[PDB]
Amino acid sequence: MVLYFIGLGLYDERDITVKGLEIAKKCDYVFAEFYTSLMAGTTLGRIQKLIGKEIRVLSREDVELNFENIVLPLAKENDVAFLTPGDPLVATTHAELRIRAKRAGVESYVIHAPSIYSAVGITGLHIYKFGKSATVAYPRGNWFPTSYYDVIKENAERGLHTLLFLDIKAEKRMYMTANEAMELLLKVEDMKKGGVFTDDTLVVVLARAGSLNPTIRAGYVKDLIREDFGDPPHILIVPGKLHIVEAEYLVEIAGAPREILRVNV
Amino acid sequence: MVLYFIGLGLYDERDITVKGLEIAKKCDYVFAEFYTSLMAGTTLGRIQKLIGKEIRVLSREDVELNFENIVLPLAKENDVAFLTPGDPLVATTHAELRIRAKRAGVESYVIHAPSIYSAVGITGLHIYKFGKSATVAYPRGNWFPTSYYDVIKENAERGLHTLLFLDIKAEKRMYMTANEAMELLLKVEDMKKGGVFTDDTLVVVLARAGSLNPTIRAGYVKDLIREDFGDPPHILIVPGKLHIVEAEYLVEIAGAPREILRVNV
Numbered sequence: 001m002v003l004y005f006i007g008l009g010l011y012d013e014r015d016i017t018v019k020g021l022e023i024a025k026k027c028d029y030v031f032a033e034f035y036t037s038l039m040a041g042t043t044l045g046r047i048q049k050l051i052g053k054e055i056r057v058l059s060r061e062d063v064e065l066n067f068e069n070i071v072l073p074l075a076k077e078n079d080v081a082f083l084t085p086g087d088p089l090v091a092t093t094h095a096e097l098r099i100r101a102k103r104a105g106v107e108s109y110v111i112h113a114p115s116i117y118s119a120v121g122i123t124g125l126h127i128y129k130f131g132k133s134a135t136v137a138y139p140r141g142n143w144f145p146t147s148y149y150d151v152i153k154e155n156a157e158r159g160l161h162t163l164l165f166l167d168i169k170a171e172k173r174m175y176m177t178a179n180e181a182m183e184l185l186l187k188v189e190d191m192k193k194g195g196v197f198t199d200d201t202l203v204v205v206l207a208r209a210g211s212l213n214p215t216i217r218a219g220y221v222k223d224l225i226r227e228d229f230g231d232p233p234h235i236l237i238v239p240g241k242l243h244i245v246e247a248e249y250l251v252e253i254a255g256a257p258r259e260i261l262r263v264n265v
Numbered sequence: 266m267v268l269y270f271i272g273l274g275l276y277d278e279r280d281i282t283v284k285g286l287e288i289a290k291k292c293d294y295v296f297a298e299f300y301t302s303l304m305a306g307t308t309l310g311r312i313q314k315l316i317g318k319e320i321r322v323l324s325r326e327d328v329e330l331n332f333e334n335i336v337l338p339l340a341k342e343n344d345v346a347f348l349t350p351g352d353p354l355v356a357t358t359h360a361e362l363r364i365r366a367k368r369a370g371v372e373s374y375v376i377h378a379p380s381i382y383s384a385v386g387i388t389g390l391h392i393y394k395f396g397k398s399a400t401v402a403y404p405r406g407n408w409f410p411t412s413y414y415d416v417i418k419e420n421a422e423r424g425l426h427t428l429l430f431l432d433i434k435a436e437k438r439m440y441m442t443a444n445e446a447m448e449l450l451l452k453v454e455d456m457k458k459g460g461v462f463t464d465d466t467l468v469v470v471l472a473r474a475g476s477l478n479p480t481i482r483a484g485y486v487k488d489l490i491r492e493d494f495g496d497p498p499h500i501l502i503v504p505g506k507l508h509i510v511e512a513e514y515l516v517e518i519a520g521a522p523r524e525i526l527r528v529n530v
């Protein structure tokens with residue numbers, strides 16, 4: 001009669017909360033999805049061993065098209081858990097799944113976990129200054145999406161930071177790197193000439209948030225474009241004008257050049 | 266010899282991540298602050314019991330003025346943890362504490378935890394659509410804060426949602442309710458008359474996120490301003506233009522007026 005949406009957190013199997021773990025262990029059935037995002041610091045095997053339950057992985061179609069006949073039926077007469085990377089309901093499509101549960105007469109509860117949305121606080125950038133978020137998508141064939149560029153423009157002109165999720169081919173487990181994202185943005189800039197993203201733009205790269213050893217780097221595109229930030233996942237941020245406290249953190253903790261203290265504040 | 270900033274999460278002691286718990290259990294000294302937010306589902310005793318360590322609680326003055334005199338000295342020869350509600354670096358000024366650690370020759374690590382900043386996904390509003398955030402502060406003396414009103418205006422004009430953290434006076438055990446936040450906003454509206462926040466404005470209230478049964482309500486100010494949303498903490502959200510699926514969730518899960526389903530594209 002109960003369905004639990006449980007977040008797995010940022011990077012590895014220990015990023016789930018104690019609450020989520022204890023509840024998952026008590027569930028008769030445990031499902032999971034790894035298409036909205038991946039848990040790069042662990043494996044399905046390690047997650048299963050921690051929970052002590054067999055985990056049935058669901059594809060995007062299994063969920064978007066058949067959630068009500070795969071998961072809900074069991075949730076009707078058993079306690080069922082649905083695991084997702086990060087924080088449940090951050091992925092735009094998950095919220096609606098609670099409506100499906102209601103429609104099927106199944107109770108649902110949400111057990112939160114750390115999300116990259118809040119984890120960016122580790123970059124020293126004030127969370128309240130983050131504006132609208134966007135995803136940098138690989139251009140395919142004759143399709144060259146560029147809306148994320150406009151998101152940066154609108155945020156930055158209002159002095160706000162822009163969190164940029166990078167493209168990922170879930171099932172294929174291949175991530176877009178911050179370097180590729182910077183290359184694409186420079187391409188988009190050369191096409192729109194909005195003076196939004198250039199070699200002189202200050203950016204921040206956050207890699208493997210959740211890990212004890214994440215890579216946090218800040219600097220100008222011209223210097224970071226070919227830098228090695230380590231293994232995925234990568235997150236790219238284009239900050240707006242900086243409060244001196246943010247700039248000093250980027251310098252002391254993210255190795256940013258002293259130049260940002262006079263150019264970006 | 267290390268300093269760990271470890272988040273405890275949204276509501277109770279089990280909102281800590283497994284990673285955070287396992288690390289905290291092995292620290293030599295554990296400090297904490299409980300003035301940045303309210304964890305309404307636990308007690309210091311219960312947290313101490315879970316971690317198996319004695320927790321020294323610090324006040325805002327202890328941290329802001331003497332972090333380097335109370336915590337850092339021990340971190341030089343021992344494994345020390347500093348615990349905070351929610352995520353340690355979200356809507357706090359704790360990030361700067363890492364600079365103090367650096368200058369004192371102490372390496373620091375951050376362990377994230379569920380944050381209200383991302384937990385708002387449970388309202389059904391798309392997280393990427395949230396713009397700049399703000400805090401509704403209690404007026405004091407002849408000083409009556411109003412910036413949060415301009416934030417709402419700016420975000421709304423772009424069709425973005427606005428997350429409003431509500432004030433807290435931990436030492437006086439005063440926690441601003443969504444009702445009090447709405448009353449203050451109506452006063453600012455009369456003062457500025459920008460048509461930003463009125464009785465017909467749609468708002469969303471989220472109380473005690475993290476608990477298994479948080480209060481999630483959506484409706485017009487005129488109808489919710491006197492509604493009892495239960496015990497604190499409370500967060501107030503002023504949505505921008507809604508997507509049809511956001512409206513559906515607000516109606517189905519947050520009991521919003523069925524008339525909002527009819528969006529004005």
Ligand SMILES: Nc1ncnc2c1ncn2[C@@H]1O[C@H](CSCC[C@H](N)C(=O)O)[C@@H](O)[C@H]1O
Nearest residue numbers: 302351352355380381431473474498499500
């Ligand atoms: N569980 C919860 N439910 C509702 N609001 C919450 C909340 N936890 C925090 N808040 C809101 O945020 C304010 C604290 S701001 C500090 C937030 C914290 N670092 C975090 O990551 O959540 C509170 O005054 C309240 O308005």
